[PDB]
Amino acid sequence: PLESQYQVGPLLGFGSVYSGIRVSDNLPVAIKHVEKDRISDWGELPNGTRVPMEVVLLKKVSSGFSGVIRLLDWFERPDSFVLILERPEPVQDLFDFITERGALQEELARSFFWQVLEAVRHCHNCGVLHRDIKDENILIDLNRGELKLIDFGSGALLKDTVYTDFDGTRVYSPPEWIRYHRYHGRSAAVWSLGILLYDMVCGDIPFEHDEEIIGGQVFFRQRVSSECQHLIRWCLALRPSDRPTFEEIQNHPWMQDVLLPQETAEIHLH
């Protein structure tokens, strides 16, 4: 039973996520409700039970690596599924963090971006494509300086063939999706990481309209180092084959000498 195993609190944050505590060990959790009528892609568990694809993807990435949110449990109800998700405390998502702080110092953006890269690599290694990388979908564990990727509700199994469907965030989507309604998983992910990196070092995303997305011009509204500008422009290459691999991103000169998560918390979050 769900009502007997968790103490349910107030809403957090058209989504339905509640604060919670696991009665067993007083662990803080987030309790996410998903209506069956609104589920786009369905999947099957090893037991063959029909579950939301979100549950499938969350189970595939769940492990000791704390760069991705951990699905602690889930329940099925007549008209909905309920997901028990990890809740760090204290926490703030990266969108609110950038709103309150403005453009991030490059040392801090480097640490955050590096941790997002490791988390996305973990997803891909587990066969999972997130498809909605953005600052809203990144939680900051403020005391540990660790970032957590959340909300796989738009994700898919990773494949090497073309995708013709998309339900992530349009202003983070690549120009090949805007123009042709097709994309490949990894190069589309890299485009969204370019949007995210610009967002971190300039204080907001670069493109709001389709014509900006396909236009291929990146104006920098903030002082940004030449090295970081190069990485961003590389990630935002119009031709997908021109974009860097994850290895090329992490080997880029701007990415060297990253701070550890604990150093990040003490220098920038405490």
Binding site: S154, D167, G203
Partner: peptide
């Protein structure tokens, strides 16, 4: 300049 969230 207005900064905003963008639903999926």
């Amino acid at each position: 300049r207005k900064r905003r969230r963008h639903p999926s």
